[PDB]
Design a protein around this nucleic acid. Sequence first.
DNA 1: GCTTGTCACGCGATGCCCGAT
DNA 2: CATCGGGCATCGCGTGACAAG
Lengths: 323, 289
Amino acid sequence: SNPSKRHRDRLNTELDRLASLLPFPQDVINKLDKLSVLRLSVSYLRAKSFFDVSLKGVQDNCRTKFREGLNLQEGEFLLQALNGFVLVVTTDALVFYASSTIQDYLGFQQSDVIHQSVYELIHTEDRAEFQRQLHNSFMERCFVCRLRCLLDGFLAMNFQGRLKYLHGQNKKILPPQLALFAIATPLQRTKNFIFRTKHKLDFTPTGCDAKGKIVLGYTEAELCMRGTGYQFIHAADMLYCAEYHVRMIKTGESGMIVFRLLTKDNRWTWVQSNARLVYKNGRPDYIIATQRPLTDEEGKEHLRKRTLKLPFMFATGEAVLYE
Amino acid sequence: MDKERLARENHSEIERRRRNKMTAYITELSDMVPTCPDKLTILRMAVSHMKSLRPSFLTDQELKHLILEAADGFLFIVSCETGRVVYVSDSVTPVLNQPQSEWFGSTLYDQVHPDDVDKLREQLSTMGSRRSFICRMRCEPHFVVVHCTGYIKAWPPAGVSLPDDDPEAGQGSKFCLVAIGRLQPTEFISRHNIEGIFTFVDHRCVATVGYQPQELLGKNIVEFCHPEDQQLLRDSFQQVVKLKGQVLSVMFRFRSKNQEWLWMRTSSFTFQNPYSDEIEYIICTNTNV
DNA sequence: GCTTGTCACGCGATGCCCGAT
DNA sequence: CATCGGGCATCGCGTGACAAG
Ligand SMILES: c1ccc2c(c1)cc1ccc3cccc4ccc2c1c34
């Protein structure tokens, strides 16, 4: 042997002693490198130091064993109800903490994100914005960014959080800095899915097939209890639908018409439809409309390529429907 | 340049930066332990402190603390069948000014506004099975708008022990909602019924009266109107029905989002079913003055 | 078949310890 | 009370083996 190897071996022994103590599963620790071992040790220490100041059950009146068990996982229950992940970032743009669920949204391992620069995860076009959120002086924050997604590739996410002092960081003795405690959440079969609906002569629906109940979301009864079909139509398409209804009254066939229908979610769905008149003893009896749902891009393309220029043609809004 | 020498120097710089990172982390360690010397002693003291401190990185209470410090809110776990409150966090007291006794042994329908009860059912019957909505919760009875976001989970949860003589032992619910609740010169077109209820609202309303379409949809327009103008507005809506196709202009005052009165000119006409000539709804164009 | 990075090693320049001046 | 040379320990540098991707 030689003194250099013995010093390096003492250093590696202390590094392995640090590594075995980290609060991570053994399969995660065994795949770590010395540098990230030290980094995660520092991170655990700083987190414990902050919680040793900022931190510290079910109201005894309502305490049962099962309620205590639920209370012991309250934190994970909250993390799962988040629909996103937690992110605490220092003034130095370092990730003080990121919850495990970041892997379920971005693909990054919690062990690789902590104590790293947050800008490594932020898009280059949005980083500046983030910085202005890190620094006339109220506290609450809410904004939008785009973060790298390895499952995609980027993902736009809404950050809702606050600026609070990150105590117990022993900087040099400096006073504590202002860290961002934020919650990051995401943002909000068409190949021949043709469905047919039967209507009265005033376009009151009366019948609908399975794929129609799947597209629109109404039970066959719920579809007919809400009046005529003009209650289902976007206000930007009501006049086109009325025009094509007049056309079908005149000639028996409406022709292809693209318009928006209100679902049971109070959402809009583009449909390309064709209404035909059915006759009994030479008189009109009911209507048979054949619809094929459309993507948003195709719908807006048909809208910008419209032949008829009518009022409200370019309006966008929301609606509700009652019986 | 020379590929070999360039690669050699790049590699040397990589290793040098690695060494600098290691010494910096060791200095952070010495800053982060009780009393702190050379690298080996700092590492030994770090091992000792981490031993005394100590699988999740944070404890459950630390994670809950981080989330509640980030964006407030309180957790509740209800049953999908009856809405029976299975669990509610103590954070309900700082959020709704309500003790845990009010929610336990109760049902979420009993805690919300009656007008939202039906809405609640739509969110409980039967990406993941996420849920998110907005309701009004209790606190004379006072109510607050609460945004809820959660998920559908199979019951009972694994890990939690359920004794024989526990209240949950007889309920036998299969699915539960686990959620967090948190407190929170232009014109626009709209469609009402013949009573004045907003059934369609243009998105421009925010730039016109400060309200989102959800705050308008379902409500009557007369509720936003000034009492000295309410009968004028009502008679406008009544006369526009008798004169189908004809336009009717009416000026009134509108309670903006900031509880401020604006002057609005509304032009209303009626939409006729092109077959039965019946009144489908009333189209209004509401403009700022 | 190349890139980036992890780890061990050899190698001196100082560091600390400590009899011996 | 220092000051001084021993021998080992600490520590920063560059380089080569080796492997994940
Ligand atoms: C559910 C509810 C309403 C309608 C619908 C489905 C399908 C339609 C297909 C063509 C069509 C053409 C002219 C006017 C219409 C008015 C209402 C509806 C349709 C129309």
